[PDB]
Design a protein around this ligand. Sequence first.
Ligand SMILES: OC[C@H]1O[C@@H](O[C@H]2[C@H](O)[C@H](O)[C@H](O[C@H]3[C@H](O)[C@H](O)[C@@H](O)O[C@@H]3CO)O[C@@H]2CO)[C@@H](O)[C@@H](O)[C@@H]1O
Ligand SMILES: OC[C@H]1O[C@@H](O[C@H]2[C@H](O)[C@H](O)[C@H](O[C@H]3[C@H](O)[C@H](O)[C@@H](O)O[C@@H]3CO)O[C@@H]2CO)[C@@H](O)[C@@H](O)[C@@H]1O
Lengths: 327, 314
Amino acid sequence: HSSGLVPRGSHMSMDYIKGMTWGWIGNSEDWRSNEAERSMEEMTNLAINWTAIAFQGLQETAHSPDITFAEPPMVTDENVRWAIAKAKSLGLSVILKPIVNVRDGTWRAHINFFDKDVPCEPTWSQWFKSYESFMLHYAKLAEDTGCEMLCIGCAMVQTERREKEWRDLIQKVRQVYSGIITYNCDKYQEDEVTWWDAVDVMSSSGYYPIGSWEHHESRIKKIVESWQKPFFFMEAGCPSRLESGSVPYDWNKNRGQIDMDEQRVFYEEMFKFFHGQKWFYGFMLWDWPAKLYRLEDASENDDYCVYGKPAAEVIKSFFTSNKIAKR
Amino acid sequence: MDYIKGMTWGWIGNSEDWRSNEAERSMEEMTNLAINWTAIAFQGLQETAHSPDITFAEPPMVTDENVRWAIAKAKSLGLSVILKPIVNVRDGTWRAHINFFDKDVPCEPTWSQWFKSYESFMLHYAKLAEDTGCEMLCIGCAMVQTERREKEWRDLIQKVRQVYSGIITYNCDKYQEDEVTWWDAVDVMSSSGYYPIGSWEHHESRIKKIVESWQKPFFFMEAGCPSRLESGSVPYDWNKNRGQIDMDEQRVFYEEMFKFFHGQKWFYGFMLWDWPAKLYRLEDASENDDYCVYGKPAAEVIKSFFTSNKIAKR
Ligand SMILES: OC[C@H]1O[C@@H](O[C@H]2[C@H](O)[C@H](O)[C@H](O[C@H]3[C@H](O)[C@H](O)[C@@H](O)O[C@@H]3CO)O[C@@H]2CO)[C@@H](O)[C@@H](O)[C@@H]1O
Ligand SMILES: OC[C@H]1O[C@@H](O[C@H]2[C@H](O)[C@H](O)[C@H](O[C@H]3[C@H](O)[C@H](O)[C@@H](O)O[C@@H]3CO)O[C@@H]2CO)[C@@H](O)[C@@H](O)[C@@H]1O
């Protein structure tokens, strides 16, 4: 498996990702609606060639070992096979992205256990066994459906120090899934994962504020060059809200306070600094819902979604531009 | 260092409870355990396990006047005092999970923010400990996921030493005696002795080796067990089998703990858990499921242990 700028041929240079995330948060009833097919078709007008099929699994608290998946209201295996096949039927390559959320609302980056096993607390080994059942379930589904890529986790910051357990999980994933593996580290954490060598492609969440993108391009370029792996953004986006570009990751910032231009300016700056560099492999944007609002409602919508908003035209002109289209 | 024969008083630290007529009577009754120490214990609060701001000395938490009262009352009863300010989390998360990213990032609160807030809380009470002549200050309790922040703990302890001239301890959690790298920075090692029935001989051997490796005094800053069905298997679990009364279970826990931990010269005794500011009636004791031993057989085990000549010689 071990490889540098190019994943070994048996797992596929690496594609340049022109992507949009579809289906979050992963609600069976939404994915089985008529609306879901129309949503995914409309998403193709972004001139994407990839989609990340994203959906939640659940644990009760940040310190509980048991992860539930594929039970109401979460997506069924049939819902997931449908989304993958529909995406492929539209000419998209697929990243399967199972994401653990915490029922009590805690940000998943805080999921954590004591360093030292004690008789009175759940252990890292218990949580990793549950997380392995979750991720291997979907790794097997990714193999059966021919997903080009699997993302084995997303911003699991307080688990990343568990290097032996992550490398053990990745070895188990390799036994059931033959495609490309990535892990999506959180914003600002590109240099903090000690096991990047164990995946094929490095990726992070590009929620960097307006005015910071030139700085982050220099920072990330040096990290990627130190690892000699391909790198892309597994998430990047910004809500269409007042001052959201200062905190593009904060999905609770200024709800209902619409600013289309703020989202537009975020995208223009991100693409100004991250474009066609040979070490960079593009963008999986965030995000596009299974049930898409009416075009007539777009100018009053405060979501990350770009549908009907000026940012969609920045994305389309970037993805159809010769410099990007040739990558 | 004294041999501690102690009971914790006042938890969770509710101003209304501490100002009740009942509080004085509760503390007087506690002296019948033949204790010579009490830990005056009370909460501060932060919203979540990952929020940096600690609130204290605001309703419903104890006023500074309430804390001066409890310290002076205890001393008026001939007791030495450990002051024990404890941070809790409003959302109910066990404080051992309080934690921040190792690496400062612009999008999250930082260790330095939380430690500044924790410093404000602990230095407030260190100054009150000094002003009131508390013999000892406990600078934290089972803060497991902070203990790796060694520089910040040592920095806090330096600030506490500038304002408080008494004995400092830190109370590590059950099973964590060998896991604190900065024991040297406090005067006395302490832990939470919530070891299950059948395990005390094992833990005496484990802890003896840890304490002799450090060459510092050690005692249990907490130890106890609810009077509940099968509580002795998980003495620390305050939610285990609520309302399912078993006096003998609590009694057996105490007899075993004292069988194995007694007069060893490396060992400096027990701060037991715990005794409320508002004490239940004696006639309600046989239906009470709390850690409190008042009116229960375990109280007689404690009294006979604390008044025994081998423990009286220490
Ligand atoms: O879909 C309804 C569901 O929304 C829940 O909040 C979500 C937000 O709406 C965003 O979709 C948010 O996106 C973040 C993801 O968690 C990414 O993995 C992360 O890296 O950044 C993006 C952008 O902020 O996700 C949350 C869920 O995690 C929530 O409000 C829920 O109650 C509601 O039903
Ligand atoms: O006093 C009412 C208050 O109780 C809260 O629960 C407490 C329990 O009743 C116990 O007193 C428990 O004691 C633990 C302490 O946290 C020690 O520091 C720890 O080391 O172990 C002991 C023994 O288990 O403390 C909790 C509070 O932390 C809670 O139910 C609250 O809602 C209620 O108002």
